[PDB]
Amino acid sequence: MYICGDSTECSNLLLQYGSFCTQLNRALTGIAVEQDKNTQEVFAQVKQIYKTPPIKDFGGFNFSQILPDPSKPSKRSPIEDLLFNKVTLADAGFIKQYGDCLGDIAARDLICAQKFNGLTVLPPLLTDEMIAQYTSALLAGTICSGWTFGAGPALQIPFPMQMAYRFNGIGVTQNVLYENQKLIANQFNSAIGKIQD
Amino acid sequence: SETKCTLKSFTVEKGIYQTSNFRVQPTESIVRFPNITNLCPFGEVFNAT
Amino acid sequence: GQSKRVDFCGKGYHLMSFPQSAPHGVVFLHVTYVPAQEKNFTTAPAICHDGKAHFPREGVFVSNGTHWFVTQRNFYEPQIITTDNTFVSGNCDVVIGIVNNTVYDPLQPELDS
Amino acid sequence: GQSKRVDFCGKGYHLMSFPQSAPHGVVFLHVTYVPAQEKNFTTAPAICHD
Amino acid sequence: FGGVSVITPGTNTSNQVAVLYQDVNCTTWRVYSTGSNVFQTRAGCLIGAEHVNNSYECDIPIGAGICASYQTSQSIIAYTMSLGAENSCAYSNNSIAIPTNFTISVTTEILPVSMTKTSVDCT
Ligand SMILES: *[C@@H]1O[C@H](CO)[C@@H](O[C@@H]2O[C@H](CO)[C@@H](O)[C@H](O)[C@H]2NC(C)=O)[C@H](O)[C@H]1NC(C)=O
Ligand SMILES: *[C@@H]1O[C@H](CO)[C@@H](O[C@@H]2O[C@H](CO)[C@@H](O)[C@H](O)[C@H]2NC(C)=O)[C@H](O)[C@H]1NC(C)=O
Ligand SMILES: *[C@@H]1O[C@H](CO)[C@@H](O[C@@H]2O[C@H](CO)[C@@H](O)[C@H](O)[C@H]2NC(C)=O)[C@H](O)[C@H]1NC(C)=O
Ligand SMILES: *[C@@H]1O[C@H](CO)[C@@H](O[C@@H]2O[C@H](CO)[C@@H](O)[C@H](O)[C@H]2NC(C)=O)[C@H](O)[C@H]1NC(C)=O
Ligand SMILES: *[C@@H]1O[C@H](CO)[C@@H](O)[C@H](O)[C@H]1NC(C)=O
Ligand SMILES: *[C@@H]1O[C@H](CO)[C@@H](O)[C@H](O)[C@H]1NC(C)=O
Ligand SMILES: *[C@@H]1O[C@H](CO)[C@@H](O)[C@H](O)[C@H]1NC(C)=O
Ligand SMILES: *[C@@H]1O[C@H](CO)[C@@H](O)[C@H](O)[C@H]1NC(C)=O
């Protein structure tokens, strides 16, 4: 279609070396498949989808800006909602409609110009909602079980003890956390608020 | 020498170079046509009344 | 060697690996440790003895229905909470979630005997 | 997990991270511990007792 | 205009085929045929497959969360894929789970190391 759009005579001549069209398609297909694989490897690390826990005091640690906002039609966290609003995509949805490209001649829409010349954009396998669910599962797991989540069974732990282990990890004796728990939680909460802004 | 020509050099560094292919030359030719004995009717085609 | 990178050398905690050859490539066998059966125990940040606050040195404070013990984090093997298993830092006024119980001193019976 | 690799999971000492979704990608929030106020003390490699 | 792709069970099993029309909204023309079994996905109008409410693991991916498979008398079906097992952890400020036993597990990993070496005589 790109080379010989609507031309019988051109098509018959294209066939004198059409084995080249096949190779172009083979290469693009390989890319298209890879792109869904990449998405799955980054996000589908955990095949156990843990329900986001009710928000309860986690020891002064406020995760409401990273966890899904239930009031939204799409349960994105406040930060994710911002990230999605900021990145601009050329179009939305994968159905373009011949009838709409035929009707709206005046807009000279680039997407229709691409479609009529044989250029097509394919849909992703996972939707944004599906990605959000994987992200939420990872956060839910992290908050209730720390790293045991990835190692095997998710073993519940009080959030502040999870932090104590993380402090001993970096090399600061855990009593520091427990003595400064309110300070630490407040700085944490402040930092998250600053990121969204 | 084939290596030297390929590399455009009169000096070759230590290593392995590919040098085309072993080739075989023909020694004689064979001509085979059907054993046709008649001349075509040039007279009839060009000398018609 | 032994890697500490999560998911780098397989799932679970890595212990060791063994290579095997293959046409055009390598196949690794990764041996890992995976936690299995588990139990639900009550816990607390610290044990209050005589007004001083005791923290575990290498473990977590764990309670069964009636008693407190200290265990290693990755395996349920209860120890008596003693002055050798804990360290002391600060008093019992600051830490949230402090429980009492007692901390055993191995020297006192020697002084008495 | 928790990582010991320098600056791999952000500058400072790594404590934990939280992923967030974005169109065509991933955004990580990395929480790290950073030393703040500090003082200069005299030091020695060892103490000589008896 | 365009947008056509074909979903095929292997031909060594059956010759039933479902066809996806990427730019068609059946909620029904600019298709080669209908014949019922018309399901609208966000990836196009899928004709020749039965949509079911049973979510399963994905086999032949279509797009936008929809995946197909061949099953029971067997026909092509479509469904929204499962992302994983449902699970749940408890969260409490005074309760900890501690392993009491372990498993030694050995898993494998496969990586390419080298590619076939070739050489070409252009003449
Ligand atoms: C986490 O912090 C946010 C502020 O960033 C808190 O949200 C506010 O809550 C009060 C009380 O309901 C409302 O009047 C404000 O309008 C909210 N502000 C915003 C920006 O939403 C939230 O309650 C805190 N959550 C926890 C668990 O501490
Ligand atoms: C360590 O640093 C923190 C953070 O700056 C200090 O906490 C602040 O102290 C001032 C003065 O009292 C308050 O106005 C701020 O509101 C506190 N910040 C927070 C997040 O609570 C702390 O005093 C410093 N000294 C220590 C721990 O000894
Ligand atoms: C918590 O652990 C303690 C120590 O093992 C258990 O107490 C012992 O129980 C045995 C009988 O099974 C007695 O012979 C010992 O004399 C007890 N020791 C002490 C210090 O009392 C205790 O029963 C366990 N608690 C629960 C609820 O199972
Ligand atoms: C640990 O034991 C101490 C006593 O040695 C308890 O402290 C008393 O708590 C009551 C609470 O109503 C106060 O009125 C007393 O004045 C406190 N006495 C002293 C000496 O501090 C403490 O509450 C116990 N803690 C736990 C977790 O059981
Ligand atoms: C045609 O006929 C003449 C005699 O009239 C003769 O000389 C000539 O060679 C002939 N041409 C051919 C092609 O045979
Ligand atoms: C631990 O407690 C939770 C919450 O009550 C429960 O769902 C789980 O089955 C318990 N189990 C263990 C240690 O197996
Ligand atoms: C744990 O949460 C309960 C409320 O569900 C509260 O009464 C209790 O004091 C809390 N304990 C600690 C150590 O935070
Ligand atoms: C088809 O058209 C209807 C009516 O405008 C719309 O609600 C629906 O979302 C469209 N379907 C797709 C896949 O876009």
Short mmCIF file of C-alpha atoms in Angstrom, two decimals, chain C residues 10 12 27 69 73 75 85-87 89 105 107 113:
data_model
loop_
_atom_site.label_atom_id
_atom_site.label_comp_id
_atom_site.label_asym_id
_atom_site.label_seq_id
_atom_site.Cartn_x
_atom_site.Cartn_y
_atom_site.Cartn_z
CA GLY C 10 17.48 -17.16 40.61
CA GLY C 12 15.07 -17.18 46.82
CA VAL C 27 23.07 -22.99 31.14
CA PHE C 69 12.10 -15.17 73.26
CA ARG C 73 15.26 -13.35 61.64
CA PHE C 75 14.48 -19.10 61.20
CA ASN C 85 21.51 -11.44 73.29
CA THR C 86 20.46 -7.85 73.75
CA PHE C 87 22.12 -4.51 73.99
CA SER C 89 20.34 1.85 74.72
CA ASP C 105 21.78 -12.24 83.65
CA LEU C 107 26.35 -14.10 86.08
CA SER C 113 26.82 -20.41 93.98
#
